């Protein structure tokens, strides 16, 4: 064995505590680069002219922010979709003013998180598993691509990507509703049904299994000690759980197949979050939620307001106030 | 392999129809997103300069030029939010552009009526609209029945290219597991992890 | 939802944030547990469609907890090793999240909001160059209130003349 | 920033009090036979 064979055997080794693998040789440096630059920029970056209007927004903890208000601020609107690495700037001071760290973090992160998905295939291949855990992770990964990359591409600027911060996240959400009426888009509604349903089915599957645990312990001990790692028998009574849940609703609404149950647990949140990602990614090209503004009209022609018109009044207030110095012309076209 | 290839091509076509006004001409497909934002800035430069404004020297609220400003490499570009779209190139705009960008002398003198008609038409046919095809911003009232073909073509092909990437991952993982022989699950009599040493 | 943003600043509330973590965590747990089981299944039959290889009366586990544990320990660093704790944690996460969100709404019943950060308001009021995403969101909140209140609250008989309306430039 | 004067001790005790409660319970578990 030469050094390359010895190296390939180490990289793909199933005995490493964290699996490296070929996707990992990309995942490891990119995520480390994205993490290190994130922590530094979150702590100590100077303010960033995100809207390209010489109006820098303070994102870091050292410049006034707390954990909630802090953010790595998206790059300048003057940059747009232009690639802005450090070596494009005339100085680090210029790079920091124009929101350089944001581009470095999101590009490294999206590259690394894509390789995290490939690493999930890779280990399942090395362990002899079935390969589709990485398909389930494609749901949050697509969402990350939607808010960090796809939405900037459609709108023409990385200044419109989701900021790397808690309050900046809320700013992204409110502005997005103002411009796209995302609540009235069915892909976000399918997304909500995914996460509400996912949380419901998480609590449902958790409670039903916990409800049907076979008595293996006394009263003075945790029931979790009734399960031993790697035991062959199942630790709960699925027939009793089906007998309960099939009587809570009706018999044919309840799963008696654990494989069908667990596939449904995978499929419901993943498909919904896939649809939520396609919500953002197609509102990136300005195909917006449903507009029923002034849809109900009386016999004379008077507008009869609905709840959709009330939503519009809130959307108008977000619209007229967002980026309050950035618009010179009467339409916000991107 | 074809699924990954098709997903990659669908993402490419999504960007083709969104940005390119050469093989998707704006007379047939409508203005691009960048085009209409550039066309609004052109419309309000033309109107205000007709009212007597000196558009080269007009300061916006931020101190950047209200109509014209510099790109980060110094080309003269349209001001406002449309600074992000200064890479837009279209046949109605390129006559006004000199060696260093938008020419102030050309802007004062040589804007033809066909350009003014094109700028107003493209600004009012911006690719923004609702799923029920109400044209314009999300806050617009019902009247205009418009969603640009570029928006329909880009959004459809983003959805298709995304699900085709999912299909690529699904079939590529399944083909590996099927060729290696564990696509139906783990053999209980020779489970692979059971003959690996513990991680700790 | 939009009322609670514009009036209560409900996204800034840590009880809502704990609810968001419970819901999105529970959806993560729903997706991750279902995928892991379905991808660590034991070959218990010859079909390529693997649902038939489960029998509802079998004593044996249909998937490999040991293989699932090794996968996640190497991918992610940690992994469940106790199936009972795993399924309790799937109860706990969205249930605790929803309970946490309920407490924050009980505060909003009295307008006890997490509306502001006082230290940022003191600094922003004296330093007109100090801007965060938090001060940006409050401008959005002020827009929401002035633009929606006359029709959303038609018992108040709000007449806000157009010149009183907060607006940015142009729009 | 003009932050709450009690915020530092409120945070420090919010960490340290239940953290040391868990440390006490864990270490006495390990010392059991």
């Amino acid at each position: 064995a030469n050094l390359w064979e010895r190296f390939c055997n180490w990289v793909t080794s199933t005995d490493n505590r964290l699996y490296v693998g070929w996707f990992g040789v990309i995942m490891i440096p990119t995520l480390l680069a994205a993490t290190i630059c994130f922590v530094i920029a979150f702590i100590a970056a100077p303010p960033v002219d995100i809207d390209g209007i010489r109006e820098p927004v303070s994102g870091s903890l050292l410049y006034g922010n707390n954990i909630i208000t802090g953010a790595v601020v998206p790059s300048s609107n003057a940059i747009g979709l232009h690639f802005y690495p450090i070596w494009e700037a005339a100085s680090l001071d210029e790079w920091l003013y124009n929101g350089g760290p944001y581009q470095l973090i999101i590009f490294h992160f999206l590259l690394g998180a894509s390789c995290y998905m490939g690493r999930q295939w890779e280990l399942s291949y090395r362990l002899g598993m079935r390969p589709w855990i990485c398909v389930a992770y494609s749901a949050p990964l697509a969402s990350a691509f939607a808010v960090f990359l796809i939405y900037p591409i459609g709108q023409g600027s990385f200044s419109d990507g989701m900021p790397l911060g808690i309050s900046g996240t809320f700013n992204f959400m409110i502005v997005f509703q103002a411009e796209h009426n995302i609540l009235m888009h069915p892909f976000h509604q399918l997304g909500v049904a995914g996460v509400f349903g996912g949380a419901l089915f998480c609590a449902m599957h958790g409670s039903l299994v916990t409800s049907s645990l076979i008595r293996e312990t006394t009263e003075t001990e945790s029931a979790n000690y009734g399960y031993k790692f790697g035991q062959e028998e199942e630790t709960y009574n699925i027939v009793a759980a089906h007998g309960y849940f099939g009587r809570l609703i009706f018999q044919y609404a309840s799963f008696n197949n654990s494989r069908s149950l667990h596939f449904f647990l995978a499929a419901w949140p993943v498909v919904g979050v896939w649809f939520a990602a396609l919500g953002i990614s197609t509102m990136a090209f300005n195909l917006n939620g449903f507009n029923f503004n002034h849809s109900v009209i009386d016999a004379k022609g008077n507008v009869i307001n609905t709840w959709a018109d009330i939503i519009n009044r809130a959307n108008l207030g977000m619209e007229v106030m967002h980026e309050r110095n950035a618009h010179n012309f009467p339409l916000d076209l991107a | 392999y074809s699924l990954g290839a098709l997903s990659m091509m669908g993402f490419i076509a999504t960007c083709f129809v969104w940005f390119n006004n050469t093989v998707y001409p704006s007379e047939f497909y409508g203005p691009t997103g960048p085009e209409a934002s550039q066309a609004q800035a052109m419309t309000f430069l033309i109107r205000d300069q007709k009212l007597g404004a000196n558009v080269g020297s007009a300061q916006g609220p931020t101190g950047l030029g209200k109509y014209l400003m510099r790109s980060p490499t110094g080309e003269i570009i349209f001001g406002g939010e449309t600074m992000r779209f200064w890479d837009f190139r279209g046949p109605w705009l390129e006559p006004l552009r000199g060696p260093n960008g938008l020419d102030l002398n050309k802007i004062k003198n040589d804007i033809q009526p066909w350009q003014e008609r094109r700028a107003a038409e493209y600004m009012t046919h911006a690719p923004l609209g609702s799923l029920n095809s109400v044209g314009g911003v999300a806050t617009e009232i019902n009247s205009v029945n418009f969603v640009s073909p570029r928006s329909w073509l880009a959004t459809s092909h983003f959805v298709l290219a995304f699900f085709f990437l999912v299909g690529h991952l699904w079939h590529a993982g399944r083909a590996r597991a099927a060729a290696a022989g564990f696509e139906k699950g783990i053999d209980r009599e020779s489970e692979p992890v059971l003959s690996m040493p513990s991680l700790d | 939802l939009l009322f609670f943003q514009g009036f209560h600043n409900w996204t800034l509330n840590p009880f809502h944030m704990m609810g968001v973590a419970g819901v999105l965590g529970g959806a993560l747990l729903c997706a991750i547990h279902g995928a892991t089981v379905e991808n660590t299944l034991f070959q218990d039959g010859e079909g390529a469609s693997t649902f038939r290889a489960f029998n509802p009366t079998q004593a044996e586990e249909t998937y490999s907890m040991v293989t699932a544990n090794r996968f996640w320990s190497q991918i992610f660093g940690i992994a469940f090793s106790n199936k009972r704790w795993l399924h309790f944690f799937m109860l706990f996460v969205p249930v605790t999240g929803l309970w946490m969100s309920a407490i924050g709404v009980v505060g909003l019943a009295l307008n006890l909001r997490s509306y502001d950060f006082i230290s940022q308001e003191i600094r922003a009021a004296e330093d007109p160059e100090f801007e965060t995403f938090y001060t940006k969101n409050l401008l959005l909140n002020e827009g929401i209130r002035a633009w929606m209140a006359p029709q959303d609250q038609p018992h108040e008989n709000f007449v806000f003349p157009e010149e009183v309306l907060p607006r940015g430039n142009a729009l | 920033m003009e932050v709450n004067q009690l915020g530092l001790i409120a945070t420090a005790l919010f960490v340290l009090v239940p953290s040391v409660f868990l440390i006490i319970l864990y270490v006495q578990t390990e010392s059991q036979q």
Binding site: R17, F229 | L194, S198 | - | -
Partner: peptide, 30 residues
């Protein structure tokens, strides 16, 4: 003190990650 506090808690979380991964109670097949 605020910035110190937030960074301190963050550093303790990252330290906790280290012990939770590398000094976990080892899962034992029995």
């Amino acid at each position: 003190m605020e910035t110190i506090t937030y960074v301190f808690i963050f550093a303790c979380i990252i330290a906790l990650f280290f012990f939770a991964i590398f000094f976990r109670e080892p899962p034992r097949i029995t």
